[PDB]
Amino acid sequence: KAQREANKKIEKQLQKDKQVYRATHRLLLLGAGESGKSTIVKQMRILHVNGFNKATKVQDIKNNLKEAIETIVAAMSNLVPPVELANPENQFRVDYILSVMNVPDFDFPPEFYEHAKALWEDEGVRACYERSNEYQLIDCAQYFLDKIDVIKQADYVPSDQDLLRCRVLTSGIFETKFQVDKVNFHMFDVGGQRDERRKWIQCFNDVTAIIFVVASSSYNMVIREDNQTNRLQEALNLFKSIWNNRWLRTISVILFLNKQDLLAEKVLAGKSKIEDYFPEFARYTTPEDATPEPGEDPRVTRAKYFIRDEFLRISTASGDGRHYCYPHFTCAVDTENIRRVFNDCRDIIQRMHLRQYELL
Ligand SMILES: Nc1nc2c(ncn2[C@@H]2O[C@H](COP(=O)(O)OP(=O)(O)NP(=O)(O)O)[C@@H](O)[C@H]2O)c(=O)[nH]1
Ligand SMILES: [Cl-]
Ligand SMILES: [Mg+2]
């Protein structure tokens, strides 16, 4: 008697578990390396779980800080033409920083912060930083190098922005579950460098939607994997691969044209011309229905819409009735931007999942 009763209790439990799964939106974050996928996940935690509640991440921030200064300083003599210190008295600091580049488990002594700060204030170091698209530099370099004095304090506690800016590699598949207004979301974060893309197929089962993230600002950079392929070209080629992939033909794509702040900054700097990398930009005109933010520099508007339209040219070329691409301009480190963008996705995501039920 109690045997059949335990049994269909398990079975009522099983049926509830099936309905939870069916109604949970599985969101797969795809995009090339450093496009911003893990930062989007961190924002979902800030907005909808408990964020980072931090002391675990202090070493990661210090490692980013160290990677940034040592990368810039190492690049100075390797650029063509090389970049010289503005104050050649700083050479002994260059020597120190380069000498500790590959020490595992670095102990971050006070001289490290002293030398890093002095070098970061050197106009030559800064001129090398301004050429960083000629080498490989983490995006958070300026943010952390500007607060060396904060990070080095013994009582340093990272802010939420520090944790968002912190770059770590994503080796493997990382899941994050969260609930917004009793709707359940299940986000899958994966690495986006080329070798990590072999893992992506493991997540294609029962996907509700893809969030495809692009570093819009990286149009003048090349990928780490071969130090030759343009990063935006790689993003486009990768998006075409996803849009047309055998397993993902039914799956709609929310396209996050991310790093809008860095793109704005690169446009305003005026050094790196998009048409030097994408010659067709010279003939591109901002669309009639563009909606620039008040005061946005029209050069920025034209840039960001050109990049959007390079992706939409791919997504409009196939799939017309079977899946759709929803573009959004994003700044993944801006919590209020991601709050607004994600809220504007919740209705379309619910609709994607409902249509999936009729197809099954
Ligand atoms: N200023 C700015 N920084 C951004 C933005 N999106 C990401 N970043 C920064 O760019 C770096 C890379 O971001 P991350 O989320 O780790 O990229 P990813 O796509 O997960 N990289 P991977 O594929 O290797 O896992 C981080 O330092 C992150 O803070 C953005 O919109 N604006
Ligand atoms: Cl990218
Ligand atoms: Mg990542």
Numbering used by the authors: 17 to 69, 88 to 394
Give the published text.
The G protein-coupled receptor cascade leading to production of the second messenger cAMP is replete with pharmacologically targetable proteins, with the exception of the Gα subunit, Gαs. We identified two macrocyclic peptides, GN13 and GD20, that antagonize the active and inactive states of Gαs, respectively. Co-crystal structures reveal that GN13 and GD20 distinguish the conformational differences within the switch II/α3 pocket. To increase the probability of selecting function-perturbing hits, we took advantage of the fact that when Gαs switches from the GDP-bound inactive state to the GTP-bound active state, significant conformational changes occur at the switch I, II, and III regions, which are known to bind protein partners such as Gβγ or adenylyl cyclases (AC).
To elucidate how GN13 binds to Gαs and inhibits Gαs-mediated AC activation, we solved a co-crystal structure of the GppNHp-bound short isoform Gαs/GN13 complex. The structure was determined by molecular replacement and refined to 1.57 Å. GN13 assumes a highly ordered structure through extensive hydrogen bonding networks with three well-defined water molecules. One molecule of GN13 binds to the switch II/α3 helix pocket in Gαs through hydrogen bonding and hydrophobic interactions. The side chains of GN13 I8 and W9 (IW motif) dock into two Gαs hydrophobic pockets. Finally, the I8A and W9A mutants of GN13 completely abolished GN13 binding, underscoring the importance of the hydrophobic IW motif. The Gαs/GNP/GN13 structure strongly resembles the Gαs/GTPγS structure, suggesting that GN13 recognizes the active conformation and does not induce significant conformational change upon binding. In particular, R232 of switch II in Gαs/GDP is predicted to create a steric clash with GN13 I8, explaining the state selectivity of GN13 for the active state of Gαs. GN13 binds to Gαs/GNP with a KD value of 0.19 ± 0.02 μM. The active-state inhibitor, cpGN13 inhibits cAMP production in cells by directly competing with the Gαs effector, AC.
